Each structure stands twice: as C-alpha cells, then as structure tokens.
Structure 1
C-alpha cells in the first residue's frame, strides 16, 4: 500500500536522524570505552552482573536494520550503556567516570533530538 510506503519513509528518516544522534553521542566517548561489547572472554562473570549488555556497535547494528521504531527505544539502549557501566564499575574508576561524562554530554544532544523528532513528526 501507499500508507505502508509512507510509514517506511518516516522510519527511514527517523533512522537518518538517529544515525546522526548516534554519531554525536559516540563522539562524547573519545576513549572508545563504550564502542564494543564487554568481552566475555576477558570478563567471564559479566552476565552474572549485567543482564542486558549494550554498546555502541550493537546499537549501530540495530539502527541499520531500522530496528528503532521511535526515539524512546534508542534512548533505552543508550541508557543501558551508561547504567550497566555505573553498576559494574566503582565510582573511582576511569570506566564509571567515562559513563558520567557521556551521560552529561549526551543529555544536550538528546534534548534537541526529542524536539526534532516531535517537530518533524
């Protein structure tokens, strides 16, 4: 149908916008701490601690399959990155501190993204 196409164009354009959002958030992680999944070879107990691992490469795979239906779903995954790190790692660590800085800096990006998603519809 023509409606299904129109819907698919909306999703494509959301995906375009979320790709730019993802790039902007990942720039706030210049150390690449959140770039890839925590290695279960190197942290073998990880899934005992963290039930829903997340990282920027995993988000990008979902994004490129157009697997984010709305900004809320995308934000859920970004918050997992931060929140997982802040639980597994102690406050005095470079990992925790990187997550705080990513959260703080990402907030600004996500605030305007929400306005754009509502604005463009």
Structure 2
C-alpha cells in the first residue's frame, strides 16, 4: 500500500537521524571503551553480572537493519551501555569514569535529538 511505503520512508528517515546521533555519541568515547561487546573469552563471568550486554557495534547492527522504531528504543540501548558499565566496574576505574563522561556529554546530543524527532515527526 501507499500507507506502508510512507511508514517505511518515516522509518528510513528516523534511521538517518539516529545514525547521525550514534556518530555524535560515539565521538564522546574517544578511548573506544564502548565500541565493541565485552569479550566473554576475556571476562568469562560477565553474563552472571550483566543480563543485557550492549555496545556501539551492536547498536549499529540494529540501526542498519532499521531495528529502532522510535528514539526511546535507541536511548534504551545507549543507557544499557552506560548502566552496565557503572555496575560491573567500580567508581575508581577508567571504565566507570568513561561511562560518566559519555552519559554527561551524550545527554546534550539526545536532548536535541528528541526535539528533532518531535519537530520533523
């Protein structure tokens, strides 16, 4: 139907905007601490601690399959990256501290993303 096509175009355009958001958030992790899944070879107990692992590569795979239907779903995954790290790692670690800085800097980006998503529809 034509309605299905219009819905698909809206999803495509959201995907475009989320790709720009993802790039901007990933620039706030210049150490690449959050770039890839935590390795279960290197951290074999990880899944005993963290039930829903997340990372920027995993998000990018979902995004490119147009698997984010709205900005809330995308933010949920971003918050998992941060929140997982802040539980597994202690406050005195470069990992925790990177997550704090990514959360604080990403908030600014996400605030305007929400306005754009609402504004453009």
Q: Would the TM-score normalized by the shorter structure come out above 0.5?
A: yes
In 2, the alpha carbon distance for the partners of 1:29 and 1:9 equals 31
In structure 1, the gaps of 5 or more residues are none
* Partner of residue 7, structure 1: 7
Aligned residues: 121
SS class of match (1:109): helix
> What are the superposed Cα offsets for residues 49-73 of structure 1, whole Å, 9 maximum, x if unpaired?
0000000000000000000000000
Per-residue deviation, 1:15: 0.0
Per-residue deviation, 1:108: 0.1
In 2, the alpha carbon distance for the partners of 1:43 and 1:97 equals 19
> What are the superposed Cα offsets for residues 70-97 of structure 1, whole Å, 9 maximum, x if unpaired?
0000000000000000000000000000
Q: TM-score, structure 2 length as denominator? A: 1.00
In 2, the alpha carbon distance for the partners of 1:22 and 1:112 equals 13
> What are the superposed Cα offsets for residues 15-74 of structure 1, whole Å, 9 maximum, x if unpaired?
000000000000000000000000000000000000000000000000000000000000
> What are the superposed Cα offsets for residues 87-113 of structure 1, whole Å, 9 maximum, x if unpaired?
000000000000000000000000000
SS class of match (1:69): coil
SS class of match (2:41): coil
CA RMSD of aligned residues (A): 0.1
